[PDB]
Design a protein around this ligand. Structure first.
Ligand SMILES: *[C@@H]1O[C@H](CO)[C@@H](O)[C@H](O)[C@H]1NC(C)=O
Ligand SMILES: *[C@@H]1O[C@H](CO)[C@@H](O)[C@H](O)[C@H]1NC(C)=O
Ligand SMILES: *[C@@H]1O[C@H](CO)[C@@H](O)[C@H](O)[C@H]1NC(C)=O
Ligand SMILES: *[C@@H]1O[C@H](CO)[C@@H](O)[C@H](O)[C@H]1NC(C)=O
Ligand SMILES: [Ca+2]
Ligand SMILES: [Ca+2]
Ligand SMILES: [Ca+2]
Ligand SMILES: [Ca+2]
Lengths: 445, 443, 447, 444
């Protein structure tokens, strides 16, 4: 029923800047712009608001984040904030995000790692229902419970538990990838990751599969079969005792029946690195999988994704060598060799500048500009090697964490905007505030 | 659009009726997480200030002023406006669920806006300013004013009031920031401003004054001197000796905005110097909160009686420990009449009543400092005392306006007080406006 | 100004897309409004005998392209001719009313006789594929050389440049060959054009078709002739008597779009187990789907859309969508209500624009202007069609009226969320020549 | 944005300078195909009417009015506006190439618009009407008027004139429909309307009249009767006896629209009753064409001299065979003064000149009927005669306004006359506006 102001409709989910000639990094973000903050901040000293997910279709946006009363990471009950809204314009021509349905989902169930997607029926959610820590989940035999929910245009929420005993038979743990999903054709597509049980069909299918991705102009000096050894062990990090940590994609038919006809796609690990959080993006006619750099590879990754009815295929990724993320040694931001780790942080890149033949040239995102610590969020435009002039939250050292970015255009002014939702350090009210930062994309001629 | 039925009977009523208990045996819990319905700034210089809030038995209304470049820029601003309903999650936790969330931003500069929840939506009274307050007090024409409404459909409409007639005796005039109230088919707003010297309204107040006193803390000045100082408190030096006057504006609620407005000016034998304020309705009682911008520090609630289109004020309730910071000689501990414009908006919400409806106790968030806007502290107050408190921080913390509203989740038998407070911010602007929530407990 | 223009902002997001995505509604509950006034961007004749005919139209997300052929002395005069060319953008007035705003408007009139021209909107302007004709079609099928062809382009600066194709090589296996009149389409760095003509008997291309045929059938109306007879007839339908039994063949030509015209041309010939006898046609791109429209010049009357997939420089066609009430007039035994395979060259160009889709992108309904007559080119009526039925109609006239070719393209004004269909129709004229080419406009309604 | 160099020296000049030849030995060719730059209607009731055309040595301007529901409807309308340049194809065939093609359609009802090609683009003068002509003659305020411009960038800007001051003495006032002309840093538009009875402008025409006569066809009425009829002709009965008056408006051409407008009201000892018209510039001569809305049938061209911001008119050239249909007693063959509002806009383009610049011949498309708007016929005319003609049809055919402009393709040594004509349509509304093109030939 509700729809964005027509100022935005033709500029959402599109290839924003089509340019074959200009240097990608001649495009750069403006100063942050003041607009209607649609993301609730904590109201107590210990309250934890973390794990944002965001998706926007040409009719509405969907947003969610997790809330824990007593502090973050606490093994405790949690609830989700959920919002459904539309873009509007003031009389002065300034965009604002206008939320229509704004609820807390807080009941007997502990929904974690939730991803959201804007579908024709409202805001679809994929969550894990957890009663164990991740550490414990990798040791129990049963897969993790998972639920497909929807906040409807009427503001009501309904959900259906998936049959994970069947759907995730070959897994010991499984979680949505936190980043948004995408509605494609008649289905909703969500990133998933978790652990495979040893010697299952899915595990055997990945036996001996690996890929080594390299830094630009910065060769790993290690011997080659040593690199191969380390790349293989990177799929089985020591934190969970040698279980293969696997990337997947889950598609669900969009219908008034939730959980209808789900299909799991597991790409070969000759393409994907160790399973991690991620996001399914649709820009123009192209789809991508973002995968968080939780393993040894630091440059931001976008795997081209093509849809084959109910399944997907991924292709060799775009990489953005200056769009690093912090991580612990030996997988810090400047890392160049394969190795085994679980680290990094979710900071996704939004496809922004394209050739006319639709090859991606440049992305926008907010990176944490530090070698090892989650510090100094910086918004910028990135090509395969370089980074534009940047916009920073603070000229002082500042703690931050996850960021997820989405860009859209106002075609009547030909202005490109980028929204960057970032977990930022807070004072007085909890560890984090989740801030929707807004920039305009400018050009330095 | 209506509140969840868990709230039926829990909104705008006398929450605690108790003749026997000590008032300060009631006290606020620690702050509670709920759904923060108030947008925080998103840039380093963004200014969100001046909150207004009112809630009827069907919906709530909220607004605050936004300036892009910092809080003392006079050139342009916009208002954030929200219309919403109270909800409960499945576990019984409160959340404020906004339904209509808009920025009102055009070429007009709407300032000092008050909102009120009426049967047609969220009514707003704003001044449309073209010059500073200081300049307004020096120009002969009254300040322009507008009656707006955000409807349940999310559309905003407004009508300019005929201030040339309605405020002909005034040089400057503003809504009182605090919420208004819908009573007997009219919406009622606090107003304040300056009167034209020797206008009929100014002449009607000549010689009028009132001295309100601190509990068990006598002014040592002699009575004659106190009277001179109380008279001069209505004509502070900042605006060159014009009388600064309290008033109340009522408007017929109708699809026609601005219908039949009527200005009531109480005698200054009851009211102190005009200031920001709020019209409250709790049960069948109404009150005018008046900010303590003059010499009197304790929080003030004037009982208000509605007689069709006008109202009568009565001698106020005072809450001696509910002080506010101010400049010398009108600091929080001041006890003598004097002339000043200082203080801060921190309103008290009527909470504990006698069975005969006499008010005993209030909830609010005070700034617990003598002179500086520091240290917001939530508590229950009677005429003399303060309960055990809840604080945003144990460290010294800048803050400003607070406005409080209490309600009951009847379903869970839990009484709550919302305290919307301007709190110092880091990284993103001068202030963040935070809706603090406490449960009222009993010791 | 050599840089590219763009439609008004009201249209961005509403050009070349799936206009109505609806799984549940009856297709024919959508219907056209009355015709709407807008800016007629198509020149009418200015003399008693002037012939304006053979419209071609294609519109990209940045601009539209339009052309038609002009003959001074009458329409079938096998003589010199010229082309009107227009490059423009869609606009809205202050009231929101649609208008087509032409930016480059030229007559291309020189020593060359360009015929049967198709146009396509590419990132460099308006690409044109024409035959350069020095013999009638009847003479052409009798001479061994293929027809000359040219790839031209009107640029955004208003200049026209062109390159003759190497038809002696490119069309080595052909005796005659023409573009399909209907618009081409820009897909994956190349421009794609419909083509048709005659094959050299026993040439490699001709032997690759030997024995190939397909019988397409009417809805709920069975042909009574014996099966072996139907097959004999279907086979002979590829070799009409008009050109002495040479095979008349459908094809698709793709050209790399570059400042170098005529670059890297590649011819695709689909198997005649899929296509009927070659005819005029159009390459359509709607959303992510491509289609070849094929004029019903043979025995099959319902409008045809063959799904088209692009591989690299070649195309693959699939079994067609058919719209049983979107018929066209033809001479007996291939009239509008024909149901049996037979051999004939008749019909008329009236294309269908894909309009209503399933969520999974299966096509449900089209818009077009048919000629509503069994045998004569009469009575144009605009309608929405599904596989069986026709919506409520809009008519140019309640009296009997001569018309000919129609080509339709639909678009949405995103600002108002209204869908429109343009129908460019050759309509009988009085005083000024045989035809006026009229851009009809309707809004698509739902009752 | 300029015409092809094949036209240099062929635009806006005296096309045929000849003292010797019979004017009517020049004659138009058959109509020729070129590029029809004028949109036709696309619906059954669509009304396209009231063309205006002007061409400078760099570009041409064109406009016409559009009503959705029929030609008499009065509620709302829009204008089609075109800025273009003359081109030649490789074979030398003329084509009019429009560069900017827009519909101007908003809440405002612009009527009776005239255009003129200025160095800044296509200037337009329109009335912004809120009541019918009948009702405007009865209201005290003058008609609102706007000066707009379609620029070379395709953007349109406009500014309302201060008509309460500029047209203080008028009850109604409209541009003359025919094109205006750029002369000496100002654009010049024909205007007509009604004067406030007893205003200074009205009293300044009191007792003023002029009687123009047919060639070799004297009015038999007695002289005092003719004088009374001639005076009455300026106050026709349709609008209750108000004086209907000719004028000329000049505006300074500037990035500021509506700059320094000045109105000229010529004396009615020269002009007949106010009517539609056109300001023409050909060589160094300027002329005011005035439609024959009153008793006088032959086509009229008043020589016009520009002083500074005002104009002076002189006794007109008349072309006795270039008649127009009208209702009795002001029909095509009328010869006596009378009072009427009738006729039709069909202008004559100055074509053939003596070496001393005195005009000898014009081209135009006349409606060749006594009383009805029928039978458009293109021809060359002198003061008394008509050349061999070219016809749209040998059958009786309804038509209305025509406006003609001639030019030379210097490269091919061919002179052409464009004749934009409202012609009866079938299927698509009442009229199609057709740009007819002829080559000027010589018998010899
Ligand atoms: C796309 O186009 C650009 C420039 O036109 C070229 O550099 C790039 O290699 C192309 N890639 C593909 C896959 O077409
Ligand atoms: C109400 O009752 C209290 C004590 O019960 C008394 O002190 C007070 O004066 C009473 N007031 C009224 C108005 O009844
Ligand atoms: C698309 O969906 C419709 C409706 O369920 C169905 O009839 C049709 O066959 C589907 N097409 C494909 C290719 O699955
Ligand atoms: C120009 O020459 C002709 C030739 O007789 C003459 O009639 C006309 O009066 C001349 N023009 C002027 C202005 O004398
Ligand atoms: Ca497990
Ligand atoms: Ca003032
Ligand atoms: Ca041949
Ligand atoms: Ca008037």
């Amino acid at each position: 029923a509700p729809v964005h102001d027509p100022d935005y409709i033709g500029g959402i989910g599109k290839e924003l800047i089509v340019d074959d000639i200009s240097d990608v990094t001649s495009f750069y973000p403006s100063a942050y712009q003041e607009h209607l903050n649609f993301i609730p901040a904590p109201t107590t000293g210990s309250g934890c608001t973390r794990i944002p997910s965001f998706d926007m279709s040409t009719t509405h946006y969907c947003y969610t984040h997790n809330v824990i009363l007593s502090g973050c990471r606490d093994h405790s009950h949690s609830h989700q904030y959920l919002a459904l809204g539309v873009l509007r314009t003031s009389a002065t021509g300034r965009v604002f995000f206008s939320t229509l349905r704004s609820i807390n989902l807080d009941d007997t169930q502990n929904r974690k790692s939730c991803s959201v997607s804007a579908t024709p029926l409202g805001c679809d959610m994929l969550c894990s229902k957890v009663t164990e820590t991740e550490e414990e989940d990798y040791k129990s035999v049963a897969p993790t419970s998972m639920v497909h929910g929807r906040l409807g245009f009427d503001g009501q929420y309904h959900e259906k538990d998936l049959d994970t005993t069947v759907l995730f038979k070959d897994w010991v743990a499984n979680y949505p990838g936190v980043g948004g999903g995408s509605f494609i054709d008649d289905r909703v597509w969500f990133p998933v990751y978790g652990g495979l049980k040893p010697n299952s069909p899915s595990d055997t299918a990945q036996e001996g599969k690996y890929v080594i991705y390299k830094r630009h102009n910065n060769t790993c000096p290690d011997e080659q079969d040593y690199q191969i050894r380390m790349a293989k062990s990177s799929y089985k990090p020591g934190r969970f005792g040698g279980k293969r940590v696997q990337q997947a994609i889950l598609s669900i038919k969009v219908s008034t029946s939730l959980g209808k006809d789900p299909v799991l796609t597991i790409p070969p690990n000759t393409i994907t690195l160790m399973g991690a959080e991620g996001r399914i993006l649709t820009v123009g006619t192209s789809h991508f999988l973002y995968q968080r750099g939780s393993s040894y590879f630091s440059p931001a990754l976008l795997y081209p994704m093509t849809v084959n009815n109910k399944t997907a295929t991924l292709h060799s990724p775009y990489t953005f060598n200056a769009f690093t993320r912090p991580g612990s040694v030996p997988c810090q931001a400047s890392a160049r060799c394969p190795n085994s780790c679980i680290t990094g942080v979710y900071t996704d890149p939004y496809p922004l500048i394209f050739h006319r033949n639709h090859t991606l040239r440049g992305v926008f995102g907010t990176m944490l500009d530090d070698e090892q610590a989650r510090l100094n969020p910086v918004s910028a435009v990135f090509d395969n090697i370089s980074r534009s002039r940047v916009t920073r939250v603070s000229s002082s050292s500042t703690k931050a964490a996850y960021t997820t970015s989405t860009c859209f255009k106002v075609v009547k002014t030909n202005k490109a905007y980028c929204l960057s939702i970032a977990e930022i350090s807070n004072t007085l009210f909890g560890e984090f505030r989740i801030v929707p930062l807004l920039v305009e994309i400018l050009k330095d001629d």
